[PDB]
Write a protein that binds this DNA or RNA. Structure first.
Ligand code: ZN
Ligand code: ZN
Lengths: 132, 132
DNA sequence: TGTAATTAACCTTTTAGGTTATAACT
DNA sequence: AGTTATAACCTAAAAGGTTAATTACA
């Protein structure tokens, strides 16, 4: 019989909720999400099992959204092809040292100019010596 | 003898202040800035003349910081060379419709991959047909 | 004239860019 | 040992977009 730690006006009751989620303009509903939900407000409390499941769904969704505009495999492929490590790739293309790990895991979207420059150099790798 | 509207503990007194400012890691001091300053806290109040002068200095500083890594003239040049309007350029290179106006005015720094892709296409303009 | 092109405030989301941890590998 | 990649966490900036206010310019 726990009370909502937020509004203090509803009880937390175990059930399920479809959770809308938006990333980079793409909308989805994460459905049947188990948790404790406040009768009164939006406060929700998930256990570890529920949090983990939920976050995995969110991570999965974002990766599929990013994969609409660039395949993580294409990025890794062009990088290893230019014989760059991720840190070397980030120095040239920008984004900070973690940049390419984030693109290649599918968690962050590269700049449109990063993608397009990767496409130019995929067909014309020798051009890297011009701008390195 | 107007009291500080922020801390209520100091009077606003007319004088000058050197104002540190940082942009994209570059630090400067905007010197001798006229205004009303609170004796107690950092609260300052500038009239229109003082605000305008100050903001012009801030805008000037940011533009010179951006110009360290990319000349606005180089950007306009490559864009008009690829026969792109700013909106057309933004669609290909990213950044939203206002992107290129912000770069070309010197107010925002383009992605390192935007700069480098602009460099590739400056020497090899025909390559735009590959990724457009 | 009025239509496209650009500059401008101004707003929210997302990456840039970096620190520190962890772990695998060389 | 240092090298590579992944991971979470930060702040500061640009991405991306809406609206308005301007400047070329048919
Ligand atoms: Zn509640
Ligand atoms: Zn004060």
């Amino acid at each position: 019989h726990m009370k909502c730690p937020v509004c203090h006006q509803g009880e937390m009751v175990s059930g399920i909720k479809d959770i809308p989620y938006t990333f980079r303009g793409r909308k989805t509903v994460l459905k049947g999400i188990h948790g404790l939900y406040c009768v009164h407000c939006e406060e929700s409390i998930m256990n570890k099992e529920e949090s983990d499941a939920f976050m995995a769904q969110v991570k999965a969704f974002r990766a599929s959204v990013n994969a609409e505009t660039v395949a993580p495999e294409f990025i890794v492929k062009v990088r290893k092809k230019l014989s760059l490590t991720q840190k070397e790739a980030s120095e040239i293309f920008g984004g900070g040292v973690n940049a390419f790990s984030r693109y290649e895991k599918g968690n962050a979207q590269p700049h449109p100019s990063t993608i397009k420059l990767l496409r130019v150099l995929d067909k014309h790798p020798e051009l890297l010596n011009e701008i390195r």
